[PDB]
Amino acid sequence: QTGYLTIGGQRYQAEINDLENLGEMGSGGQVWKMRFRKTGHVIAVKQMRRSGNKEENKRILMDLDVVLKSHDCPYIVQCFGTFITNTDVFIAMELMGTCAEKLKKRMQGPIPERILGKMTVAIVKALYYLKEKHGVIHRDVKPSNILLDERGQIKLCDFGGCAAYMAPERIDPIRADVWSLGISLVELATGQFPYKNCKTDFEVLTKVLQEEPPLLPGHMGFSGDFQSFVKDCLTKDHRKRPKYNKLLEHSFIKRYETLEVDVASWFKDVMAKTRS
Ligand SMILES: *CCC(=O)N1CCC[C@@H](n2nc(-c3cn(CC(F)(F)c4ccccc4)nn3)c3c(N)ncnc32)C1
């Protein structure tokens, strides 16, 4: 069914004319920020043009399919509804604040372990949900796919790859997403991408295979649980890399499943800082 917006359990009949375009978000894919004139809600809207590339449109529809089926996972960006016009398809998504990549750039430094713990719990459960309930492999985990908002939520988006986060077995032939998560955790925890000064994508792949896993430093106060979780994620031999069932029992996951962390206040403090 299309032509309806469902925000907070309230289904509203709506058409494309009921949305006010507040401008494109980011650059490079065209995601608008729009306002629902009937309630005042602000939402993210993905526009798929009928005259667009048949390859990108085919990918958007399959990714929309997974998104529409993930309505029961709280760690995946939710779809509020769709609009199908004669020349376009508009996909309405819940509006988040920004991604972890832009949080890193705005922080201009490492991201605290407390925040990365809640992020690790959310992303692993999002990946385990996609695998167990839908048989979907993400195949592209990176900081630009991890969204946060003012309310402290951390959710996964844009699944359906980037060579910088590719696992060793994907480079030189299930658990491949575990490796990409560990690289993302090192990058966010240190503020530096672990494979530095690589001028080409191939140079990154050579360092992935030839060099030892880039684990967390020992002089930054990281807890033993965090260093252990990253070391487990960055297992180069994909046959010894833990399943999602094993990762969900890791003490790092168990700690931040129950620990109270004010991600909302931390998010607002970082956004209040200025880069321009
Ligand atoms: C690192 C973050 C970043 O630079 N950007 C660029 C501008 C758009 C930002 N953004 N994206 C979403 C978002 C994206 N989706 C997925 C989709 F809707 F595009 C899609 C659905 C179905 C099939 C294919 C694609 N959902 N949300 C953002 C949200 N939701 N809030 C705030 N900013 C978002 C990320």
Q: How remote is the CA of residue 158 from the centroid of ligand 1, in Å?
A: 7
Q: What is the number of residues in the chain?
A: 276
CB atoms within 10 A of CB 260: 7
51 and 102 part of one domain: no
Indicate if 66 and 174 belong to the same structural domain.
no
Q: Are 38 and 14 in contact (CB under 8 A)?
A: yes
Q: Are residues 70 and 155 in the same domain?
A: no
Give the separation between CA 16 and CA 126, rounded to whole angstroms: 30
Backbone angles phi, psi at 243, to 5 degrees: -70, 170
Q: Which of 79, 31, 89 shows the shortest CA–CA distance to 57?
A: 89
Catalytic residues, by residue number, are 140
Q: Please, which residues bridge with residue 79 across strands?
A: 93
| Distance of alpha carbon 170 from alpha carbon 43, whole angstroms | 36
Is 120 found in the same domain as 75? Answer: no
Give the residues after which the backbone of the chain is interrupted, taking a C-to-next-N distance over 2.5 angstroms as a break.
Answer: 28, 160, 173
- Least Cα distance to 158 among 60, 244, 24 occurs for 60
φ/ψ of residue 84, rounded to 5: -115, 105
Alpha-carbon span 92 to 185, nearest angstrom: 29
Resolution given for this structure, in angstroms: 2.3
* Same domain, yes or no: 146 and 72: no
What's the Cα-to-Cα distance from 268 to each of 18, 94, 107, 174, rounded to whole Å?
30, 18, 12, 36
Q: Which amino acid is at 163?
A: A
214 neighbors 195 (Cβ within 8 angstroms): yes
Total structural domains within the chain: 2
Mutate-to-test residue for ligand 1 from 70, 82, 158, highest number of ligand atoms within 8 A of CB:
158
Q: 192: exposed, middle or buried (C-beta count within 10 Å: 0-12, 13-18, 19+)?
A: middle
Are 244 and 127 spatial neighbours (Cβ–Cβ below 8 Å)?
yes
Cα–Cα distance for residue pair 96/154, rounded to 1 Å: 9
Q: Which of 160, 194, 192 is nearest to 179 (CA)?
A: 194
Pocket test for ligand 1, best of 66, 75, 144, 147 (most atoms within 8 A of CB): 147
Contact 255, 228 (CB under 8 A): no
Rama region for 196: left / alpha / beta (φ>0; ψ in -120 to 50; rest): beta
State which residues form the domain around 176: 98-272
Does residue 78 contact residue 71 with C-beta atoms inside 8 Å? yes
> What is the whole-number distance in angstroms between the Cα of residue 28 and the centre of ligand 1?
12
Closest CA to 17 of 34, 42, 41: 34
Contacts of 100 by beta carbon, 8 Å cutoff, 6+ apart: 111, 119, 143, 144, 146, 147, 148, 184, 188
- Residue 25 annotated as binding? yes
Eight-class DSSP state of 53: -
Ligand 1 binding residues, C-beta < 6 A? 25-26, 31, 44, 46, 60, 63-64, 67, 77, 91, 93, 95-96, 98-99, 101-102, 144, 147, 157-158
* Cβ-Cβ contacts under 8 Å for 224 (sequence gap 6 or more): none
Question: Quick one: angle between helices 100-107 and 176-190, nearest 10?
Answer: 20
Single residue among 94, 122, 144 that ends a domain in this structure:
94
Q: Method used for this model? A: X-ray
CA atoms within 13 A on the CB side of 25: 17
Strand partners, 149: none
Domain boundary among 79, 94, 109: 94
CA of 168 to the centre of ligand 1 (A): 28
Q: What is the CATH number of the domain that holds 225?
A: 1.10.510.10
Last residue of a domain, one of 94, 113, 130: 94
Pick from 142, 118, 159, 103: nearest CA to 272: 103
Does residue 204 share a domain with residue 162?
Answer: yes
Inter-CA distances, 156 with 9, 11, 35, 125, Å: 21, 24, 23, 10
Rounded Cα–Cα distance for residues 243 and 128 (Å): 9
Which CATH number is 37's domain given?
3.30.200.20
